[PDB]
Structures are given as structure tokens and as C-alpha cells.
């Protein structure tokens, strides 16, 4: 996702990625009070990137989500440590190839 740069671009420190297993639409940030303890969101602290000069400095912060169920929709969004937050995107993990549903059906 886009790199964030405040007015004085100096000392950029942190991103925060949120993801939960979601059905359709009905997902919000301020959902079922994360408060202190039992949480409603799976959270990742993402270290600020390294710029690497001025011409082509988009060394786009990212993250590899592992430990996800297959054929599952995930509500996901990023936030900049207390600037900008991304919108809630739903991402569905991969499921079976049609070919591979067939096999398992067609061969005991």
C-alpha cells in the first residue's frame, strides 16, 4: 500500500494492519470494543519502510498474512500510527480449482 509522508516527511514511524474473517459488508473499525483484552480484530504492527532517496522512493510498505483459512473472506485495512487509514477491503483466500473439485468427486 501507499507510503505515508506527513508535511515534514521526517521521522516516519509505523503502520497497523487489521484483518478479520468477515462475511459480507457489515464490518467497521470501532467494532465490538477492542478495549483492553478480548479483541474483535487481528492486528499487525508494521515497521516504517526505508525511503532509498527521492527518485523512486515507493518501497511500498506491505505484509504477508499467513495462518488464514482457505476460501475465506477477510476484512482488511491499514492505518498510520497516531494521518491516513486505507479503506476496508474484503479479500477472499483461494479455494479448490474446478478441476480439483471434480477429481475428489469423480474418484471415491
Amino acid at each position, epitope marked *: 500500500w*501507499e507510503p505515508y509522508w506527513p508535511p515534514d516527511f521526517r521521522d516516519l514511524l509505523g503502520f497497523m494492519l487489521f484483518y478479520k474473517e468477515a462475511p459480507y459488508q457489515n464490518v467497521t473499525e470501532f467494532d465490538g470494543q477492542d478495549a483492553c483484552g478480548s479483541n474483535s480484530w487481528t492486528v499487525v504492527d508494521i515497521d516504517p519502510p526505508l525511503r532509498s532517496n527521492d*527518485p*523512486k522512493s*515507493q518501497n*511500498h510498505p*506491505g505484509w504477508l498474512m499467513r495462518g488464514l483459512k482457505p476460501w475465506t473472506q477477510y476484512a482488511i485495512f491499514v492505518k498510520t500510527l497516531v494521518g491516513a487509514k486505507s479503506d476496508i477491503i474484503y479479500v477472499q483466500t*483461494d479455494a479448490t*480449482t474446478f478441476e480439483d473439485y471434480l477429481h475428489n468427486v469423480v474418484f471415491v
Partner: antibody
Amino acid sequence: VQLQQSGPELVKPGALVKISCKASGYTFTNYDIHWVKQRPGQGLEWIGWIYPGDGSTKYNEKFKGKATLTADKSSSTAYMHLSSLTSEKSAVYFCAREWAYWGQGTLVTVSA
Amino acid sequence: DIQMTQSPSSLSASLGERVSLTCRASQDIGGNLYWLQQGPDGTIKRLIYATSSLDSGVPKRFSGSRSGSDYSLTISSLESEDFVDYYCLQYSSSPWTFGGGTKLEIKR
């Protein structure tokens, strides 16, 4: 950041050819290498990808048995082998690091 | 597979003209579209990510926009180096797919 590809690649039909893509200027292991085919006078087709960290791949069904994707983290170089080449004529193959930066292209010509 | 329909496949224009190319998505792709530029030497370069975000170094005469299922690339004032090939690409869903391309040619 540079994806520096191989070829000219002249190959006989029924053979196999391995095209490389040496990466530099960034941490190889952190990104995906995607491969794309371009049949001249035409568009771009997505072949599939590799994650150099895990060695995990995903292919386009069209290219499943044809292309085989490989990475050598010791040299930070990625490969693509094409198999059983026949009347493909010529095509230019590109690797790209998650689309922002692409390699220059490698022409594979099949001739006897 | 999401089909990306690119129009026009070819376009004649002159220096200093404003031109737009379009990609229509067969399914909703949200904001997940790239615009790619290919030089006569074959070099591919990304100009726009996430429908409207310009990559570092890309001249400001390049812009991306969306209206319904139409994603457009606009060159506000053509330069001689812009008369090359352009391709859209969707990354919203598992089979990544490309538009058929637009060749931009000089009017005579």
C-alpha cells in the same frame, strides 16, 4: 532496482529452455516475481508467480504444464523453464517484481 | 476470469493534445487497476497504481480516473515520447488480466 533478464534464446522444437531474471537493488526474498508472455503484434498474458521466500507458486491454468517456475535465493536469480516447444514461433517473456518494476524481456525463437 | 476491455485499440493524435484511453471491467475490480506503458524497445513501465495513484517519476500530464466500470488513463498534453503502447491490468482477482492495448500514433 533491476530485474535483468537473459536471451536471445534460439531453441529446437520438442526441447526445453530456461530463462533467468537476476534481481538487484532490493531484498529478493520480500517480493513476488511474476512472469508475463507477449506474442508479437499482440497483448500480454499472465503466466504465473513465485514467492522466492517459500518457493510457493501459482500458475495460470493455460500455462500449468508448459511453464515451471524456480528461484535461486543464493544468487537472487529467478528462472522459468518452458517445455516441449512446438510451432510457438517466437514470444517475448518478461519477469516483473510485483508489477511496479519489470525486466527488459527475453525473446524465445523456436526453429529447426 | 475478469475480462478487461480496452478501447480504442489505436489512436491518432498530435503534440499537445489531450487524450483518454478506457478499460471496462466485466466484474467489479474496485480500485485495483494498473496502467502500464511499453516502449518500442519492449521495456514495460508502470504509470498508475490503484486506478489513480501516479508512480514516482511519472510526468504529471498522466492521470487515472474511474466512472462506473470505466477506468481511464488521460495524457493532458501529449509529448513525442508518449506515442507508444499502453495496457491496463486488474489485480482484484486471482487470474490477473490485461486489457488488449492501445497504440498511440502521431496524426498526419
